[PDB]
Every structure is written in C-alpha cells, then in structure tokens.
Symmetry: D3
Subunit: 236 residues, 6 copies
C-alpha cells in the first residue's frame, strides 16, 4: 500500500481535496456533488473519493477527529499523493457575541492548545495560517453566491469535553469566530510541503448562549458551505 | 442521540469494552470472538458492538487515531454509557534494544508530547497510569496462555510522522517499550470517572533496527494479544 | 495629557493610521504624502501627524522598536483615540528561499518568541492574525500599481541581535516570508478592541544568502510599499 | 571515597536496598529487622547498613528529603554500587476521598511539579513508573500478611509547605492516593540503569479532611509497611 | 552608520553611560548636568550625548520603551562602542506596602514576563542581576547626599497596560519594590560582555493604593535620582 | 515537636543562623567557632546548634541537599523559630573563566532549573535575590579581613549528576560564578517572611577546566569563608 492509512495509488487523488472529519459526510459530498466519482480509499473506514465538479477533478475524504488524525491524512496527501490544496469543510462552535448559529466561517488562522506547532518552531509561537489564495477564493465565492460570511480566527482544541474555566471568555474577548479540533494541525503541514490549505465551517452551536442549530438549519448551512467550497475549487 | 458521536442508547455497551483504533478491526474482533454480537454504533463509521465472551457481556469499539479521538469516545463511554473498564488493544513500534517485533507489550503507564494531561493537573506532570487490576489481569492471562509478555512504559505521540531528532534515543535510554498514539489520553479519563483502563499492544516494527513483522506474523501476534485481552475480561 | 505617551487631544488622529518604527520616517511620510498635515504628537520624540491623502483623513506615527513599544502606542490609539485601522509599514529580513531583497511582503499572520499572546489566551497558541479586509486592500492596491508582492507569515522577535541556532532554518522550512519585531504585538490588540490591523514590509536583507539591498534599492522599495499602503487606505 | 556522598566500597551494598528519608529510621530498620547488620556509610549523616533478612542479603539507607537528595543517592547506588532494586518506604499525605489515615499505599507511578523528568525526555511527559515486579511483590506480600492496600498514583512535590490553590482538589479528582516528595525522582533513575524501583507509604494525614494519625498509630502503620516491604524483598 | 540605530562613531561614547527611556529626558540630563556636551546620535530620534561630569567623561542616551528596545541600544553600546558601565535611570511604579511615591529605588535584580532570559540559559531561570559595584556606588552616593533609598527587586514587564489578575498581589507578597519595563533586559547583556549595569528609579505611582506624584514631587525626585547616579559615576 | 523536622523549642535558634548542607560540617563550625554551644536539633540527623560568636548569639544548622530540603528547614526557621537572617555557607563549583578553585564567592542572586520560583510568581521569572544588607555585610567583612572575594550570580540545580549538554558553556558565557544546589530556594522564602538571606561559597572545582582544590586549599578557603560569615553576623 502507498501508505499505512490509505489504499489509493499515487495519482488517485486530485490536486485539490476537500476534507471533513466524518467519512460518511465525505461520501454524502461525493454522492451529491461530484460526477464521475470513484472510491479511492476505505482503510479504517476513512472513505475518500475522486470525481469532478463542473468539469474539474476534485477529491473528498474524511480526516477523523483531532489534530493527530488529520495530521496523518494530510501529511500523506501532500507528501505521497502530491496534493496541492486541501480545504477543510467542517462544523464548529462559536463564542463570538456577533456570530450566530447557522453562520458560515472562513478561517484565516487557528490557535490551539496542542503542542504540535511549538514542536515545529523551537518552542515559539507558530501561527497556523490559511493560504491567502484559498481564503480569497472562499470569500469571493461566497460573495458571488450571495451568502454572507464571517472571516477570522478559529481555535483548535484537543479536548471536545472541555473543563477549562475562563477559556470561552478569553476566546470571545479576542473575537475568535470558530471553535473546532483540526485546522491548526493542517496549515503548518501545508507550509512544510510548500502547498496550500484553508478551512470553512458552519456554526452548529453557540457555546456561550447554548443556542443550537436545528437539523433543518444544519442542512441550510451545509448547503451554503459546500457550494462555497466547491465553487472556490474552480478558482484554485 | 445519546452523544454527538454515538447512536447507542444507554445500556447498549457492556461494562467492559475493548477498543482499537481501526473500526474495521473492531468488527473483526466482534465477528470472530464475540457471541451474539449486535452492532450498536456506526456514527462516523466508528463501529461498535456488544455481545458476550464465554458468557460474560463484552463490547468492542473503534476509537480512531490519536489522543483527541480516543478522548471523545472514552469520555462518552465512561460518562454516558457507564462503562467501568476499557482495555485498549493495538499495535505499536518499539525502540527498546531488548524488545523485538511480534512481542506483546502490557502498558503500565504512558508518556506523551500532548498537552492534555498538563491541562488536567495545573500544568504539572500527571502520569497516565494503567489500573493495576487490569495490568495484572493481562499479565496473568498471558501466563495462563504461555504467551511471553513485556510489561512497561509506552509513549503516546500526537505526530505519526515524527521529525524530532533525539526522541527515539531518549525513549530507548529509559526503556520505553511501546510507541503508539492513544493510551496517554485514555488513562486520566478513566481516573476522572473512578473507572479502570489498560492497554496491550503487539510490536509490528522496531524503530531503531527496522525489523518489521511480516503479514503472517502480524496476524499471529494479533491473535495472541486479543486472546490475552479476552481472557483478561473474565477476571475483571 | 490624554495618555502618558501621547500629547494628542482626542479626535486628533484619523480613523486610519499608518505606523512605522522610526519617528523620523513617519515625518518623512507626512511631509511627502500627506496634505493638510499637522504634527499631533511629540512626546518621547515619537512624532505623529494627521492630514489627508487624496481627500481622505490619514495619520502617520512612529511606534518605536519592539512589541512592548508598539503595544503601548497601539493600545492607546484604539482605546483613547478611537482609531479603527492601523497598517504597519516597515522593513524586514527574509529567510525564505523564494523571497529576495527588494520584495514587498504583505503579512497575513505573525509568529513570535514573545510571551505577550500566550498571556492573553491562558497559555495557549494565539495566532497574531491580520484583518482580511486590510490584507486584501493591500494585495489589490499592489495589483493596481503592478507591484509584485509576497503574501504570508511574518515572525516577530524580541531580539534583533539573535544568537539562536536553528531558528532561521525552521523559519525557512515553514516558509515565513518576513522577520521583523512588532507585528505579532499589534494584531491581538486590534482584536481586543474589535478593530483592524495589517502589516506590509520590504525585504532589506536575505538572512540566509546574505544578499543585501543597496540604498538606491532601499529607497525604491520604500516608495513602492508606501504607495501600496496609501492607496489601500482609500479602500478601508 | 567511591562517591562524594558515600564512603562505602563497591560490594558493600546488597543488590536490594530499602531507602527512607530519615537516616535515623534507616538505623531503626537495620537494628530491628536486619540480621548481622554493619554500618557501611555515615557521610553527611546519611546512615546506610547491610545485613540479611531471613538470611537474604539486604541493605537499608537514608535518602534525605526531596527529589534532588534521593537522585544523588539512588544514582550512586545503581551506578557505583551496582544495586538492582530499590524500594522506597515512607509516609505520605492523601487527598483521595476514599483513602484514610493509616492506609498502606503501593505506588504504581508518581506525578510531580519538578522539572527533572522533562529534562530527561526532551521536555515531554515522562511518567515516573514503578517496576511491575516490585509492585506485584509488594501487593502479594501484603495479601499474605492480610494487610489491606491502596494501589495507585503518587504525587511528588518539591514544596512541603504548599501555598498552591486548587492542587489538592485536582489531585483528588484524578484519584491520586499519596502525596510525598521523592518517588518521582527515583523511578526514572532506575529506568536509566535498567534496574528496578518501587515505593510503599503509609498515610499520616488527610490533607483535605485534616484527620491525622496519632503517634501510636504512626508506629503501627510503620510496622505494617516495613513488614510488607521486607517480605517483598524475599520474592525479588 | 556605525550601527543601524546609532550614527555615533567608535569612541564617541564614554565608558560610563546613563540611559533613560525618553530621549528628551536624556537631552535634559545632558543640558543641565554635563559640561562641554555634544550630541553624538539622533537616529530614530534616540538622542545620545557625551560630555563630562565633574571632570570625568560621561554619556547619556535614550533607550526607548521595553526590553527589545533597550536590548538593541545596550548590545550596541557594549559591543561596538566598548562601554563598560550602563546605569539605567528611570521612573517606576511600586506595589510594596512599605514603598511610597517619591521613594528612590536601587535595583539589585529584576524579574520579568519576557522570554529573553530563558532563551539565553536553555529555558531555565536566569536572574537579571545588577552589578554589585554599581549597586554599592548608588547606595553610598545616596547616603552621602542624605537621600533615603530602597534597595531590592524590580519587575520588568512587556505590557504597560496590564490585564493580569493576581500579579500585583504576588509582587507585593515577595517585596518587589519597583515595576518598570527594561532593566531585566539590560543586566544579562552586560553579563554577556563582561561589563557592568545597574538601575535606579523613582516611584511615580503606587499601583495598589493609587497615590501619584505631583508635578513638584516628580521634579525633586528626578533631581534626587540623577544626582545620586551622577555622583555614583565618580566612584565607577 | 515545634515542627515535623526540628525538635528545637521556639527561642532555641538565634535571630541569625548559618546553614550548610552537611550536618557534620554544621557541628564542626559549632565546635570550632561557637562558644557556649549547645545542640538544639537532631531530628533526621540534621544537627543544629546555638552558641555565641564574639558575645553575640548565633546558630548553625545543616540544611541537607537540594532546594526541597533547604526549603523545609528555612521556611520553618523563619516562620516558627522567628529567625531574621539566614546565611548559607557552602561549597560550589564554578564555570567562570576568571574564577579559580580556592576562591570565595559571595552570591548576589541565583538562577535555577527548579520550578519552585515560577510557581510563586504566576509562572514568570522571579530572581532569587540575596538581601543587600547581607551581601554588603559579607563584602565588607571580607575587606576588613583582607580576603579577596568574587561577587556575582550562582546557579542552583536539582541534578548533581548532570547530563545536560551546553549548560556549562552558557553559564560561563554569562559569568555565573557559583554552581550549587540550594541558594535559589532560600532567597524567595526570606522574601515571603520579610526576612533576610545570603550565601557565601568556597570554590572546590572548576567544572570546565576540571581543576580541583587540594585538601590544604579547601582548609584555607573554608577558614576564609567561615571567618567572613562570622564577622558579618556581628554587623547584622
């Protein structure tokens, strides 16, 4: 096998890949948005697919939950499969008083409570930073689609079930717009390979007000987010 | 749903759960070793099953790759599903000069480069420590099966594709016997809930000398480890 | 005085301010590019000025050397003087193999060896992140002017006379384009006040290859950068 | 002298050494439980002795207070004097809601607020872990003596007179059973030399409820603990 | 220029240099206390001057605000300009209960929230320590002038506009007498060059009780402090 | 007992105490330099004595090896025994190129690899600083005795058997004059109690050149150091 975690052969992935944590959502994206679609990985149930969107080759694959999981899959995609661009497409919480459930968030950079980026930069602060062409393509696609967006910082945590007092209030004070678990691991790997990455998320929950998106609102926001991401790939 | 990541209802998991990272391997264990197994979760493809082993209820479920992933699943099992004992079963690398491929490693405690345990203990050193009854049950089960074991420390890294110079040499100097990615996240969660956890792994690679277990040898030592864990559950 | 370090009365700064380390360079910018210009600060020699550029109010003020210095001046501008946008303009070194002396760098985010951002976010990684609209205005201005630019990460150090082995190689490995001393301190303050910041630098020295820009090249570089910034203010 | 802190000559220590913090207690142990005891060290008043227990060679020596002190003496014992097994014996506090004054605690691993173990493992989490054969020999000895035991984690602090808010509550949340000052420094040195170590302590104080053992209870607890340790040496 | 930040030529600075944060205050000291004074630098407005005090050559120069700023100017002074002694002269706040506005503080050592000294000593605690001969010269000069002094620790912060809860209370508990922003950056640079540094400050503000010095009191305080420092140079 | 580690009654210790690591050396100091001496502690063999030097009550006591040990004894002396001044009288290695074996070192401040002082000051740099009246009494006593001294920084390590590369070279670069194991823990405790501490050490070894004091040199330097300390007590 080409890697321990992926049965695809080199060339099976397109130069652009959308990734989400849930492999079953990767399948939904392929089934509903890709033509000419082929399954190219099923190791560990981490479904990956390659097809076309409006004529342009594009892949979609799950990445599992957390920085260590996406780090395995994205390192392999850049190094072995010679992918050029990964766009994470996910869901998030927010703490920002002016971000609301249903909102689409385009991520410019992501903080974290992980040690993985300190280990890359001699213990210093290494900002996990989205590629500007990717951010711009997402922003411009949303505008062309008449979809409002929030643009700004995410925070990637190792612990879904947080017990940390003061954190939410500090993230709100500095207007972090998205809380999730992966993007801070993706961007430095893109950098290491001289490649590109970005992230776009829909707000499922407001962590401070406790408001939560209905299933119908989650469908609406998913439809918005995925169309933005797909249209962005045509410009990348 | 009972949790965001698991469709099982309260009561659908036995008090003892074996977990491995690969959900397809969890299905293999259920199919080949569990009697009257029922699938109880398939959210995110993270297959989980509940049946019996020699009369005694037992569950098996995937945990994904890395500390953040196993923390979600194990927190839920202990908190929502009222699980009492989780035994992780996996493969590992080793750096120890006296540990060899195909060896079976029983983990007493696990180091890590993750921040999750410092965050639990006011920034101090918190040893991720296996429960002694679980360790001893695994040790005694292997003795009963006349399967040699190595008993000692593991190291759980966040980064599969390590670029860290001098790490392997330090791990070998202090006789770490197993290198993997999850056990250091599991043991403190068990502690928080007053529950039990342990880990048993087979050596598929020597990181220093580069020996690697053939496909045939990996299947044999998997069968050894799993029988050890299954017989251990009868004592727990 | 309205603050301990600034003799300006409230309302004497425009909502958009350009800032550079050298107060004499801020004077040179007011003299050569602002009309209707008046000196508004002289405390500690940190000259600041307010006039118009192409009809629109604009200010320009020195910020001194280092994160603590720009933090003092920026905090006051956002808090006391109600400034909305700060664009830092300056010079930098580079370690990136594909960046060369005389290049113009637009900063999307900045790493650092300072502790100021960890202190804002409970010890965690807080990416010092430029405002996207500001980044975009600078990119678009350079395009209209047919000035090539590099867009990416900076690294803000406390120590001009570095003695640190391995830092330059790690910065180059992850494609940091600019090394300077202030921007990582500016962006989180803008965040705190719900305001906007960015940074644009010209490369004076390649830290690795040792190439270095002549004074004629350095004036040509400054003139391009400052035109890019001034034209961007018209769209902000 | 063979070491700067020990006048004994190589061969003067038995392969198994009991160590306690107070040298006067080491003398008490030698006088009351060892046969044919001889004093082999008195440098710095840190009395050490060698004799037999039930005819098996055994030594007993003081180690002084805290991680730096025990590190000096243990390092020398393993390296210069070729000792193979050290069992630390002493008293501890507890925070665990279900551990009580007079309880006997057998230590599986120890956390710490010391830096010494980070310095051994490139800044990462290195669990100070007792040797499993030593743990089991202590556990089994107590069973043969019909003495109940608590088996679990200790916490070794550098600061007896703690002023740290929230520490006890977090130690209790994660079921740390013993608070003392040395074991976290002993176990990694044993690892370095490919040797064995363990720790057994009796509870003198409940840190949270403030119960305290009377002088008479402390003597009784010590008698139970030292017999468990001595009998364990016969199995090692 | 001799350095990017100083146009002075080698030999233009005396062996002893007084430095303060505000360049205009440096000009005041030169005009009012130095005989035959010449300006030797004005790069970035950072005025420096060389003259004589009661016959002995003496310079005085601004160093800007914060550790990174003083680090540049002092590193150059010791290295390029071969200076032997720097005395920082400044204002400070205090949190000490027994220190009052108008007090004169002679600094023996300085704590900090900067990273710059950890980076010099492999991440460990490196006390920024004043030269004893300089401290002694200051104390004795004040005695000779019948001006009471306070002698003790300072704390150098990167953030003038502190939001940190608990800091002042801890500084008070351990009897830090002065809070400022530079001295902990100066002392280790003097160490690197085998040279001497000290600091003296007048209390302008009590951080805890909120007393503040009047215009008249600032004047007589600065006159007291400068006379102390100037007389001290005679013994150095 | 008055404390868990000291059988002295309150009042038994004079307001000034000399302390050294070796209790047998404490006894030598009392036997040879104190009149009217009586032993006041023997718990844990940590001998302490009170008598007079030149008519003035003075005590001398061992403190054991390492920051944790001296912290226990010093905290108790200030808090329970109402001691006002502690002078550590010790031996050290040096790394400084201009410091030689046999030299006497008066410590102005001490760095460390211990966490104890970060824990006192919210994780920041807390310089362990000697009290200026004690430093000055020691310096002036040596002058009065025509004994030359070195004055400057110590470094207190937790690990006698250091394996740390680059440490000695950094300490030498910044002209640390003494390497030992305790002073950094003593000075902050004095601060907490509003009390006084200092340290004076004899150089037994050059860590870099490997020179070592002969017996005769150690006697000469010991006699010098102790006479300095004793005379200084008369002025304190």
């Amino acid at each position: 096998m080409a890697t321990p975690h992926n049965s695809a052969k080199v060339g099976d992935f397109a130069e652009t890949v959308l990734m989400c944590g849930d492999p079953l959502r990767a399948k939904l994206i392929a089934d509903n948005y890709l033509e000419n679609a082929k399954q190219v990985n099923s190791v560990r149930g981490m479904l990956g697919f390659t097809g076309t969107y409006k004529g342009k080759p594009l892949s979609v694959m799950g990445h599992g939950m957390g920085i260590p999981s996406i780090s395995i899959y994205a390192e392999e995609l850049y190094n072995v499969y010679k992918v050029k661009t990964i766009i994470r497409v996910g869901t998030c919480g927010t703490v920002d008083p002016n971000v609301h459930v249903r909102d689409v968030c385009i991520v410019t950079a992501s903080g974290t409570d992980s040690n993985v980026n300190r280990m890359r930069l001699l213990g210093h602060d290494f900002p996990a930073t989205a590629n500007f062409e990717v951010v711009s393509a997402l922003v411009e696609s949303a505008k062309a689609l008449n979809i409002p967006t929030q643009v700004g910082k995410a925070y990637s945590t190792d612990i879904f079930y947080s017990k940390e007092q003061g954190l939410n209030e500090a993230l709100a004070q500095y207007h972090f717009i998205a809380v999730e678990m992966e993007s801070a691991g993706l961007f430095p790997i893109a950098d290491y390979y001289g490649a590109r990455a970005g992230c776009i998320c829909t707000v499922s929950d407001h962590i401070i007000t406790h408001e939560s998106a209905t299933p119908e609102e989650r469908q609406t926001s998913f439809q918005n987010m995925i169309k933005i991401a797909l249209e962005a790939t045509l410009k990348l």
